[PDB]
Design an enzyme around this catalytic site. Structure first.
Site, PDB file in Angstrom:
ATOM      1  N   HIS A 162     -70.791 -20.664   1.744  1.00  0.00           N
ATOM      2  CA  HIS A 162     -71.745 -20.790   1.470  1.00  0.00           C
ATOM      3  C   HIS A 162     -72.871 -20.900   2.677  1.00  0.00           C
ATOM      4  N   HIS A 209     -73.095 -16.433  -8.830  1.00  0.00           N
ATOM      5  CA  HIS A 209     -73.141 -17.714  -7.653  1.00  0.00           C
ATOM      6  C   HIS A 209     -71.219 -18.057  -7.158  1.00  0.00           C
ATOM      7  N   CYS A 249     -80.505 -23.523  -2.611  1.00  0.00           N
ATOM      8  CA  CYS A 249     -79.113 -22.696  -2.766  1.00  0.00           C
ATOM      9  C   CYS A 249     -79.305 -21.114  -3.281  1.00  0.00           C
ATOM     10  CB  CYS A 249     -77.575 -23.099  -3.931  1.00  0.00           C
TER      11      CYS A 249
END
Lengths: 66, 774, 163, 49, 198, 145
Positions: free
Chosen positions: B615, B574, B337
């Site tokens: 995401h 995040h 990620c």
């Protein structure tokens, strides 16, 4: 002649001068464009004086209203 | 009074047209900017060791950067955004010529070819724009018929009785014979040469069924997006993976955003070995994997080289083959990620080492069937059925730092930025969006849960407080400037001594060789003098805090530009809307600010951009970068609009604020990007407002910079609209700048530059410039 | 049989071929108007004039751009009407030639019933009849009907119709 | 204001079953999936024109 | 006329496929000669510097249009349609740079009789247009206006493309009778019909 | 009509005022600085009241920091917001551990019906000439007619 003989003033001067000239249609694009010129020639000349019109036969879109 | 009375009283109205700007950063007058930076900063820093982001771009569930920024910051499209969105999703196309008998030049409905005016675009399409962009119900059209309502899986069964015999070709028969041994009876049919195959009882068979999966929603690139729109040919889009298209489009858009429309223009200032491509991806060409794993076994028609399209490094490689053709550093990192942030990290060293001077950094990842399912098994994504049970709509299913958050919304796309050496960026007069002050990564600890994040990145705030009674003089810049004045006085004196010494050595050299010998040695004297100056600037201005265990690298990078820890007003969390992440992170940053003595009641303002776009996995951090780069240059901190109710547990973290609407500030100074990938991939990056950098140069060098950026902007604007109306933004290079013949000769020359060829008008290498003494 | 308003490609071809006194097949489309009658300067301009009258507007520099691309450049603005030029030309065709019994109006309903071809398919067959002019004297209505049959075959073959 | 708590609940005062379902939900304890509230005041202003 | 002849010999004689690659190669020569020697100069030229419509700023284009059409010596537009052309181009600027529905600064082209007092007004109302190049759409709209068959042909070559001949030769006779409407009132640029014997 | 829409799971809970206070204050701060809310807008008072009704130590230190750091030299707006700053800090120190109060300061408005020359009916909520506070509103209400 284009554009020497498009001028109503020049045509008028030659016609009153006791000689034949022709109003060139080459230097006009509209029906009223020719008409306003011609009525300018008529106003300037003397009674019973005559003049011609020259139409260019390479411009059919000028002829169709000329 | 007739109609002519109120005909002249009837007035003409001038309806607006959309004028899509490239919103370059505004460059204040040198007087103003000099009052932001302190006095000592001038001439202090080595500009060769300052990383500036000069052009950013994304392709995501809100099309291009600017539209994503409008939707994020404001929440509604302006006229300019709305027309762009219509253009991106092929609603409207430009058309120049005769339309229906009247000559027309402007927008037409790409379906019905009727005139559309700019004013009207909004009213006409906005509805169709919003329902087909941003996080929404998975559109089977864009993932090769993928329906999460009817997920097709193949079940092993043993047949109970003999099958009716069917027509099979000799090649299918014999492969079926090898496959099933004696459990299949094949026979040649003498009439045709075709075969008859009957499967005998107890033979192996495969029955497809259906499976109703529970992840009906994701963050898809808007419906109608098309590579061809930008100007990619059918050959390229046929050979490559959709992810490669996102990368290509992001890269080119980032180049127009950087005012570089011809990528060869870069080689006018640097060697072809000095332009790295340090972008990454968490997974890479996942449709190629699908190709060679599912479609290969089903024996569907798949391209021969499908393996090559699947590598994470391949998408980068295509950039090089198509846009850049640089022989510089290629380093593709994978950070699950965090990838993009690790990428940015890599780029910095690739420039700090001096191996390259420009890098293309950021991430990219695609959303697919296999991925979505395995993420649902791991219980990482939000269970969409659960969210519908709560009456939550699709758009509000990613809700970071919210009490009821239940996992992240998977998205697709590609963030890219262009980092450059400050001195080189000033020289090229490219716009400067911001400075990467710091870029670091750290793995957390030992453990047995890979997904589980940890507090690894906290190490960026490591500094020893055994003795802190007296403040170090190295934190005061004046000291360092004075020391730099002493060291430059020494450098001066060393140059002088090396000039007399050369004069006395050249005295022995004969007069005919004397000119050449003096040139050759004077060059080396200039080179070394430069080197030492930069060295001094490095040691005092840039890396003064490297060896000091009483300063944290995070504090250090800020002090580099005389910024105090208080100045870091924004930190882009995040914020993946998962229980673990949004607490762990919050804790991590709270400690970070608490240890560095962040003044009490001065929390960092948290932005959770992932609440809008979802995401994108690898690209994740890249998008934040872009958001951050906007924030610094707009003063706008966009709220977490989905943060309906902030989680109670976060309240202990006194040094973090969780706004739910947009704040127009008087100026943001710096911005923190923190990412926490899978596999304990922790990463942070500090971007500083460009304005501080200008403080570090003279009024002259700034003025000619300003003039250059001005001209470059205009050129970029022109090229952007040209490419946007004619669908030719993307222009695949036909050749390399250098011929095959000069290729090796160019590579071996560290001073060869591209030049405009008179016949072509393009930038290519001239044999006169190669190992030329000029 | 279904009707179809006459195209600008056929009406351009029959106007250009008629003024030349040539067959509809002797004149290729894929050629400039200047390549046709470069010999003479008058014929070029009276071609342009007659095309201007029939279709109204003509593009800039028609004579040097070949016929085929001009076809669709007239087609988009033009709307399947016999106009003025072709109206006089079919009127001289019927009156100058010897169908002394039947006029244009009887010619239309003869094609329309006995074949089954309506108004737009009448105009199209009349443009075939204009390019293939008998020129020499024809006997009576028995020759004219046999000529209208043959002109319906040529229209059908070029356009791609069946009767 | 500080201490305050707002609960937005879908409802249809027209429905007989929603009424007692809400009341239960308010009076049921937090463990069992209620609120565990005792209501001080009721403002039944719901109306259709 | 000698440049006319040179172009007839070198450029207009070529077939249509090969005109464009010959035109783009020869561009710089063709602009220089059009500026220096022809009655119809290369439109995108600021302070004698040769540029293109892509690299022109609105204010540069307006000014240029006023310079090439508006007669300073008579203090009146040479042709009314030219005034309508410039007016229209101001309307298009206003339409580009405004930020909402507004009212037309030029309510009638009668207000263009004083050109500089309309330019300065419009570009004061829209100061961004002083420092921005023409939006591509606006360039292609500006060319479509140039091709209009309901106005006197514009007295300049706006763009080099397939159609360059037309620009270079349409309506090339009137300039003799009005020198005040030429680049430098220099006959040497203009085309005067004559008989070599007479 | 009688379709059951209520469910326990759908219930939304907001309880996080502790953050909202600081947001609301920082928005106010900026609003004053960027010439949106001036020293003659009731909304300044209203928003000051809403902030006071959320006072705690965390909010107090957040004000203290932001108002101390403010630079009144930059502009008139900065001075104004800095003065209102210390004033608010004093106010929210005083009402710490006081029950937060509903306190309406909104300009009482009466109805107006207007007809232009064309006959376009216009309804406007025009501020009452006499009554300009809730206090006065109660007084008028007590005195009847």
């Amino acid at each position: 002649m284009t554009p020497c003989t498009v001028s109503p003033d020049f045509v008028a001067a030659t016609t009153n001068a006791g000689y034949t000239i022709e109003l060139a249609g080459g230097g006009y694009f509209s029906a009223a464009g020719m008409t306003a010129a011609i009525d300018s020639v008529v106003s300037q000349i003397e009674k019973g004086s005559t003049f011609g019109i020259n139409l260019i036969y390479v411009n059919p879109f000028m002829l169709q209203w000329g | 009074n007739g109609n002519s009375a109120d005909a002249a009283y009837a007035q003409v109205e001038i309806q607006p047209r959309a004028n899509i700007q490239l919103d370059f950063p505004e460059l204040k007058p040198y007087k103003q900017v000099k009052q932001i930076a302190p006095a000592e900063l001038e001439g202090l820093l080595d500009l060769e060791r300052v990383i500036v982001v000069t052009g950013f771009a994304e392709v995501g569930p809100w099309g291009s950067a600017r539209t994503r920024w409008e939707m994020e910051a404001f929440g509604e499209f302006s006229l300019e955004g709305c027309v762009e969105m219509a253009w991106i999703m092929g609603f409207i196309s430009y058309h120049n010529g005769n339309l229906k008998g009247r000559p027309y030049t402007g927008w037409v409905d790409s379906k019905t070819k009727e005139p559309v005016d700019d004013k009207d675009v909004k009213a006409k399409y906005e509805t169709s724009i919003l329902e087909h962009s941003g996080i929404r119900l998975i559109e089977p059209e864009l993932f090769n018929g993928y329906n999460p309502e009817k997920k097709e899986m193949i079940q092993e069964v043993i047949v109970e009785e003999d099958l009716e015999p069917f027509e099979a070709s000799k090649e299918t028969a014999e492969q079926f014979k090898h496959q099933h041994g004696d459990k299949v009876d094949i026979f040649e049919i003498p009439e045709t040469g075709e075969y008859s195959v009957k499967l005998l009882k107890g033979a192996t068979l495969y029955i497809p069924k259906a499976l109703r999966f529970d992840r009906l929603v994701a963050g898809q690139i808007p419906t109608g997006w098309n590579a061809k729109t930008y100007g990619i040919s059918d050959d390229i889009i046929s050979q490559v993976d959709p992810i490669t298209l996102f990368v290509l489009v992001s890269v080119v858009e980032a180049f127009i955003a950087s005012g570089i429309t011809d990528p060869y223009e870069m080689y006018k200032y640097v060697h072809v070995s000095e332009v790295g491509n340090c972008s990454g991806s968490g997974m890479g060409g996942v449709s190629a994997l699908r190709g060679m794993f599912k479609d290969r076994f089903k024996d569907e028609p798949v391209q021969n080289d499908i393996l090559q399209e699947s590598f994470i490094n391949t998408m980068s490689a295509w950039v090089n083959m198509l846009l850049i053709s640089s022989s510089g550093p290629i380093k593709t990192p994978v950070g699950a990620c965090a990838t993009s942030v690790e990428s940015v990290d890599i780029g910095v060293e690739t420039i700090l080492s001096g191996k390259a001077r420009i890098c293309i950094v950021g991430g990219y990842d695609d959303f697919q069937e296999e991925g979505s399912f395995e993420f649902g098994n791991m219980k990482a994504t939000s269970n969409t059925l659960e969210e519908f049970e709560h009456g939550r709509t699709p758009a509000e299913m990613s809700r970071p730092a919210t009490t009821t958050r239940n996992g992240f919304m998977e998205a697709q796309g590609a963030g890219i930025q262009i980092i450059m050496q400050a001195d080189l960026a000033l020289k090229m007069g490219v716009p400067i969006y911001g400075i990467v002050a710091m870029a670091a990564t750290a793995t957390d600890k030992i453990g047995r849960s890979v997904p589980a994040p940890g507090k690894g990145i906290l190490t960026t705030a490591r500094e020893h407080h055994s003795s802190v009674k007296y403040a170090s003089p190295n934190l005061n810049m004046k000291y360092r400037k004075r020391q730099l004045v002493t060291r430059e006085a020494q450098i001066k004196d060393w140059v002088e001594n090396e000039l007399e010494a050369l004069k006395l050595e050249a005295e022995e050299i004969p007069s005919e060789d004397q000119n050449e010998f003096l040139l050759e040695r004077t060059r080396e004297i200039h080179n070394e003098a430069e080197s030492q100056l930069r060295a001094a600037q490095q040691q005092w201005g840039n890396d003064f805090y490297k060896r000091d265990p009483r300063i944290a690298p995070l504090r250090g990078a800020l002090a580099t530009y005389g910024l105090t820890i208080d100045d870091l007003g924004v930190a882009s969390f995040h914020g993946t809307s998962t229980k673990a992440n949004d607490k762990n992170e919050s804790a991590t940053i709270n400690e970070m600010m608490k240890h560095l003595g962040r003044s009490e009641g001065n929390p960092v303002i948290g932005v959770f951009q992932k609440f809008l776009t979802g995401h994108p996995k690898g690209a994740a951090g890249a998008w934040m970068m872009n958001g951050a780069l906007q924030i610094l240059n707009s003063g706008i901190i966009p709220g977490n609009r989905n943060a309906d109710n902030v989680d109670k547990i976060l309240e202990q973290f006194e040094y973090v604020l969780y706004p739910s609407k947009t704040l127009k500030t008087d100026g943001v100074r710096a911005v923190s990007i923190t990412s926490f990938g899978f596999g304990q991939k922790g990463g942070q990056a500090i971007v500083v407002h460009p304005d501080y950098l200008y403080g570090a140069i003279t009024e002259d060098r700034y003025n000619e910079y300003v003039a250059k950026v001005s001209a470059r902007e205009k050129s970029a604007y022109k090229f952007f609209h040209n490419g946007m109306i004619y669908n030719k933004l993307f222009v695949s290079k036909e050749h390399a700048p250098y011929t095959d013949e000069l290729e090796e000769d160019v590579y071996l020359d560290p001073l060869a530059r591209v030049s405009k060829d008179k016949k072509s008008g393009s930038l290519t290498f001239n044999s006169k410039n190669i190992q030329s003494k000029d | 049989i279904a009707d179809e308003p006459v195209k600008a490609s056929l009406l351009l071809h029959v106007l250009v071929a008629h003024k030349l006194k040539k067959s509809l097949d002797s004149i290729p489309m894929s050629k400039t108007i200047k390549d046709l009658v470069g010999g003479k300067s008058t014929v070029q301009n009276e071609i342009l004039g007659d095309l201007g009258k029939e279709f109204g507007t003509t593009p800039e520099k028609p004579e040097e751009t070949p016929l085929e691309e001009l076809a669709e450049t007239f087609q988009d603005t033009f709307s399947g009407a016999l106009g003025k030029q072709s109206s006089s030309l079919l009127s001289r065709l019927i009156s100058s030639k010897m169908p002394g019994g039947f006029t244009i109006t009887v010619a239309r309903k003869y094609l329309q019933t006995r074949w089954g071809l309506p108004s737009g398919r009448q105009d199209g067959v009349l443009l075939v009849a204009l390019s293939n002019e008998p020129a020499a004297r024809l006997g009576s209505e028995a020759d004219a009907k046999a000529f209208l049959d043959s002109m319906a075959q040529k229209y059908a073959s070029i356009v791609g119709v069946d009767l | 204001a500080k201490g305050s708590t707002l609960i937005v609940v879908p409802f249809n005062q027209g429905s007989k079953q929603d009424v007692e379902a809400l009341i239960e939900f308010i009076y049921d304890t937090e463990k069992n999936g209620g609120l565990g509230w005792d209501l001080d005041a009721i403002i039944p202003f719901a109306a259709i024109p | 006329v000698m440049l006319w002849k040179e172009f007839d010999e070198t450029i207009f004689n070529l077939p249509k496929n090969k005109l464009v690659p010959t035109l783009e190669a020869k561009r710089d020569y063709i602009i220089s000669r059009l500026n220096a020697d022809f009655q119809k100069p290369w439109f995108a030229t600021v302070n004698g510097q040769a540029r293109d419509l892509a690299t022109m700023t609105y204010e540069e284009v307006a000014k240029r249009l006023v310079e090439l059409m508006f007669i300073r010596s008579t203090n009146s537009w040479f042709d009314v349609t030219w005034r309508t052309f410039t007016g229209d181009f101001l309307r298009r600027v206003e339409e580009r740079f405004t930020k909402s529905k507004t009212l037309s600064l030029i309510q009638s082209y009668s207000l263009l009789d004083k050109p500089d007092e309309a330019i300065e007004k419009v570009f004061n109302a829209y100061p961004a247009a002083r420092e921005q190049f023409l939006n591509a759409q606006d360039i292609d709209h500006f060319l479509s206006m140039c091709q209009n068959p309901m106005q006197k042909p514009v007295p300049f070559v706006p763009v080099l493309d397939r159609r360059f001949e037309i620009f270079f030769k349409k309506d090339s006779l009137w300039q003799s009778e009005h020198l005040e409407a030429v680049v430098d009132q220099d006959v040497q640029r203009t085309c005067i019909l004559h008989g070599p014997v007479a | 009509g009688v379709a059951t829409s209520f469910s326990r799971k759908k219930a939304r809970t907001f309880d996080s005022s502790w953050n909202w206070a600081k947001q609301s204050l920082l928005s106010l701060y900026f609003e004053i600085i960027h010439g949106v809310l001036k020293n003659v807008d009731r909304e300044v008072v209203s928003e000051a009241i809403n902030i006071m009704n959320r006072s705690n130590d965390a909010l107090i230190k957040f004000m203290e920091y932001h108002i101390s750091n403010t630079d009144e030299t930059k502009g008139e707006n900065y001075q104004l917001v800095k003065t209102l700053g210390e004033q608010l800090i004093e106010n929210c120190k005083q009402v710490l551990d006081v029950d937060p109060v509903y306190k309406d300061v909104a300009k009482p408005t009466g109805p107006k019906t207007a007809i232009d020359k064309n006959g376009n009916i216009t309804y406007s909520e025009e501020p009452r000439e006499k009554v300009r506070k809730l206090s006065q509103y109660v007084q008028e209400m007590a005195l009847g007619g």
